[PDB]
Amino acid sequence: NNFITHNLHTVWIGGPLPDITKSYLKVWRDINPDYTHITWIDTDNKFVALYNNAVKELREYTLKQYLVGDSNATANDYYDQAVQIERGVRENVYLPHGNDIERIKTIKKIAGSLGDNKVQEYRTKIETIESSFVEMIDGGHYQHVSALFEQFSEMDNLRATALKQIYEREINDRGNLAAASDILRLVALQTQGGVYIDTDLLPHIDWDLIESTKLFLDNNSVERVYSKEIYLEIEKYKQLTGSKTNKIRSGLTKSQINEIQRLTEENNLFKHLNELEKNCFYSDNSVRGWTNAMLACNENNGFMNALMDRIILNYTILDEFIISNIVTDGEMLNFTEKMSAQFGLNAEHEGSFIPSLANYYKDSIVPNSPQATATLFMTGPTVLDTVIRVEEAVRRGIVKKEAIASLYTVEETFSSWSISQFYDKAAFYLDKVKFDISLNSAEEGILRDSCFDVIQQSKEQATHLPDIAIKFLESLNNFTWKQLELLIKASEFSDQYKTLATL
Ligand SMILES: O=c1ccn([C@@H]2O[C@H](COP(=O)(O)OP(=O)(O)O)[C@@H](O)[C@H]2O)c(=O)[nH]1
Ligand SMILES: [K+]
Ligand SMILES: [Mn+2]
């Protein structure tokens, strides 16, 4: 055949698919009807996301009481406590969560500890989740993770077994469902071949049609200037079920918007997937480096084995990191040199990977730039970038750049796990507001200026702030004109600010 098999793999594990996830996937089926579309689900992990939420609520309740019993708690003290509390709940033998039966029993016990209407709040959620899975199982497009691991274990039981253990660790030890998906996508491609995309990506569009309209005209590229706004307007015009775009607007002109709506209506905007050579491994790097959010290879790909092997090695080293209790600066070099010699690594190039292991149980709990998180180094884009470099895969022609999917969608800006909008003090103070803990004058000024910095950094686009930050801003008075103008401008792009923009 000489082309990669026309399989389009997606992954959604840990709970029902959100409406906007189903909506994005249908766009892919609409544009690539001749592909075999497979969304991998795990019917043995129906309640992981809901368990995650119950643990976070218990964590926050414990954090409020910690703050109630300790003023002068610093931001660093707060997040150390947040990480320890999370571990204590996940490790608690009275609250097992290794399967859906244990999770359900544990979710009820946590909801009963929270009081209020939390019992019926979780009871209805459990039932809604079961109904969603019944429709999925009974109502083709879905395939089962257990059948996937079984199939891969008949090809490579060694790697199948090691990867399944890592998958289950991300499911249960951290509950980081994006990181578990970092594993599943590699197994899917290595077992069956095809193309993989994250569920928040959308097909590329025909930029030649855009240019031929003359409405979108540089020490920059057209995509970097216009793609985010165009993809907002495409989704807004399609009125995708579950979309956030009913409350968001772009900065494009009426004429620009009409042209996008026309091209979208004509069904002449999205491009179908290109053919890919069967003996090559494909990703894209045209946005901030290589990403594992979009991938393509045939089954039994040699570079894929090297990628899997490095991820498996990453977890062997993390296990040594935890047991050795490596914390301080000096202890990390006694570790980095020891690991570079134990596994034949280049210590100079590993200088960033080892320190990120400290963040393994801080991801999703402590604010951090995405490039500093453990997840990116363990299983995500940064390990992909490393293996491509180490294997010299580009020069050797075994990895190539390919335009698979666009990162410029509305949903890509909403991470299921990463937190990098507010850091340190401001993030600490924002949680206090969420906990109904009054701020002093100093904490108020810091959080207020931080909110306006985030808004101002957005320039001519919507700023997606947490609901509690909006409620914080609505409790304030005596805004300056510069600040008020920022809020009026923000209301032009998002309905979140409608109240803040009213005099
Ligand atoms: O509850 C979840 C959250 C994420 N994912 C998977 O993880 C991928 C990446 O998620 P996300 O876009 O939130 O991660 P980010 O791009 O922010 O790292 C998704 O496309 C899914 O395949 C999943 O299966 N369940
Ligand atoms: K997302
Ligand atoms: Mn994403």
Side-chain angles (χ1 to χ4, degrees), residues 179-285:
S181 176
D182 283 342
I183 303 304
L184 288 186
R185 70 193 63 180
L186 305 183
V187 179
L189 291 180
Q190 189 71 324
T191 301
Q192 303 199 342
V195 176
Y196 170 86
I197 61 192
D198 277 1
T199 60
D200 62 4
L201 310 180
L202 284 173
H204 277 292
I205 59 168
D206 190 341
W207 288 101
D208 291 322
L209 291 194
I210 298 290
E211 196 287 316
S212 74
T213 68
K214 304 299 188 176
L215 280 329
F216 310 83
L217 300 182
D218 58 330
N219 303 332
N220 216 341
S221 64
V222 180
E223 296 203 14
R224 284 169 59 90
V225 174
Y226 290 106
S227 193
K228 196 178 185 184
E229 287 188 307
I230 287 177
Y231 276 83
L232 169 50
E233 295 293 343
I234 291 174
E235 175 168 343
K236 196 173 176 71
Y237 179 75
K238 293 177 88 61
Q239 303 182 32
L240 298 184
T241 313
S243 174
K244 302 166 174 64
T245 59
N246 57 328
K247 298 172 176 184
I248 307 166
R249 292 160 289 284
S250 80
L252 298 174
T253 64
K254 183 68 172 300
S255 315
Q256 285 173 326
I257 290 172
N258 284 338
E259 293 314 289
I260 291 153
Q261 294 182 341
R262 180 196 112 247
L263 289 169
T264 305
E265 181 59 35
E266 292 172 10
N267 231 277
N268 285 327
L269 199 42
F270 287 117
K271 302 205 305 303
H272 54 267
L273 290 165
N274 294 321
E275 293 279 18
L276 309 169
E277 304 273 5
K278 74 178 172 193
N279 290 328
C280 187
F281 185 107
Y282 297 88
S283 180
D284 196 2
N285 66 343

Side-chain angles (χ1 to χ4, degrees), residues 198-201 293 407 411-417:
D198 277 1
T199 60
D200 62 4
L201 310 180
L407 292 166
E411 281 298 310
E412 158 62 357
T413 69
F414 297 86
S415 181
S416 61
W417 69 280

Side-chain angles (χ1 to χ4, degrees), residues 63 75-85 362 366:
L63 280 171
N76 188 87
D77 295 326
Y78 170 76
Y79 285 116
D80 280 4
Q81 278 292 291
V83 171
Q84 298 178 22
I85 290 167
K362 299 183 174 166
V366 188

Side-chain angles (χ1 to χ4, degrees), residues 169-449:
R169 186 214 200 107
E170 292 305 329
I171 291 297
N172 292 317
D173 199 19
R174 303 203 299 166
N176 188 324
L177 295 174
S181 176
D182 283 342
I183 303 304
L184 288 186
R185 70 193 63 180
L186 305 183
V187 179
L189 291 180
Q190 189 71 324
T191 301
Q192 303 199 342
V195 176
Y196 170 86
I197 61 192
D198 277 1
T199 60
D200 62 4
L201 310 180
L202 284 173
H204 277 292
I205 59 168
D206 190 341
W207 288 101
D208 291 322
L209 291 194
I210 298 290
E211 196 287 316
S212 74
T213 68
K214 304 299 188 176
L215 280 329
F216 310 83
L217 300 182
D218 58 330
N219 303 332
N220 216 341
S221 64
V222 180
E223 296 203 14
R224 284 169 59 90
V225 174
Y226 290 106
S227 193
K228 196 178 185 184
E229 287 188 307
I230 287 177
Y231 276 83
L232 169 50
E233 295 293 343
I234 291 174
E235 175 168 343
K236 196 173 176 71
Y237 179 75
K238 293 177 88 61
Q239 303 182 32
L240 298 184
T241 313
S243 174
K244 302 166 174 64
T245 59
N246 57 328
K247 298 172 176 184
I248 307 166
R249 292 160 289 284
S250 80
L252 298 174
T253 64
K254 183 68 172 300
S255 315
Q256 285 173 326
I257 290 172
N258 284 338
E259 293 314 289
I260 291 153
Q261 294 182 341
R262 180 196 112 247
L263 289 169
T264 305
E265 181 59 35
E266 292 172 10
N267 231 277
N268 285 327
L269 199 42
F270 287 117
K271 302 205 305 303
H272 54 267
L273 290 165
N274 294 321
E275 293 279 18
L276 309 169
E277 304 273 5
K278 74 178 172 193
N279 290 328
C280 187
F281 185 107
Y282 297 88
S283 180
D284 196 2
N285 66 343
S286 61
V287 181
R288 299 180 180 180
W290 295 105
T291 176
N292 73 329
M294 65 197 79
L295 298 170
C297 67
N298 254 6
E299 67 271 29
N300 289 314
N301 178 273
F303 179 82
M304 177 66 87
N305 279 333
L307 179 56
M308 298 178 156
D309 283 352
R310 179 62 201 242
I311 291 172
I312 292 162
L313 176 67
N314 285 348
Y315 278 89
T316 295
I317 289 168
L318 171 67
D319 290 348
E320 277 285 313
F321 187 89
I322 298 174
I323 285 296
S324 308
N325 196 23
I326 299 298
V327 184
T328 200
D329 192 301
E331 287 159 353
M332 282 183 183
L333 259 50
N334 204 341
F335 198 69
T336 294
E337 246 309 296
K338 177 181 170 182
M339 298 292 96
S340 291
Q342 186 167 333
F343 303 104
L345 302 180
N346 184 278
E348 298 179 350
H349 307 156
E350 307 292 334
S352 297
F353 165 57
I354 294 301
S356 75
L357 297 184
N359 292 332
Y360 187 65
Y361 297 117
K362 299 183 174 166
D363 289 1
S364 323
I365 304 170
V366 188
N368 198 13
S369 171
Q371 300 308 126
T373 64
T375 300
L376 256 62
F377 284 90
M378 290 300 290
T379 61
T382 303
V383 69
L384 174 64
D385 174 86
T386 293
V387 177
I388 290 172
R389 163 188 70 85
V390 168
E391 305 294 319
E392 296 177 7
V394 175
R395 178 193 65 76
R396 296 169 52 203
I398 67 174
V399 168
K400 288 181 185 180
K401 168 181 186 182
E402 172 67 17
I404 295 178
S406 169
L407 292 166
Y408 289 91
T409 68
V410 171
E411 281 298 310
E412 158 62 357
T413 69
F414 297 86
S415 181
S416 61
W417 69 280
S418 192
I419 35 167
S420 60
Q421 189 174 52
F422 291 94
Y423 301 94
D424 194 52
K425 296 178 184 63
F428 179 39
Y429 306 153
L430 193 47
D431 278 0
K432 281 180 157 184
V433 182
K434 175 170 162 56
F435 297 166
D436 202 17
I437 295 176
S438 66
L439 303 179
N440 64 46
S441 178
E443 306 162 321
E444 182 168 300
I446 295 296
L447 181 59
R448 175 182 53 234
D449 302 322

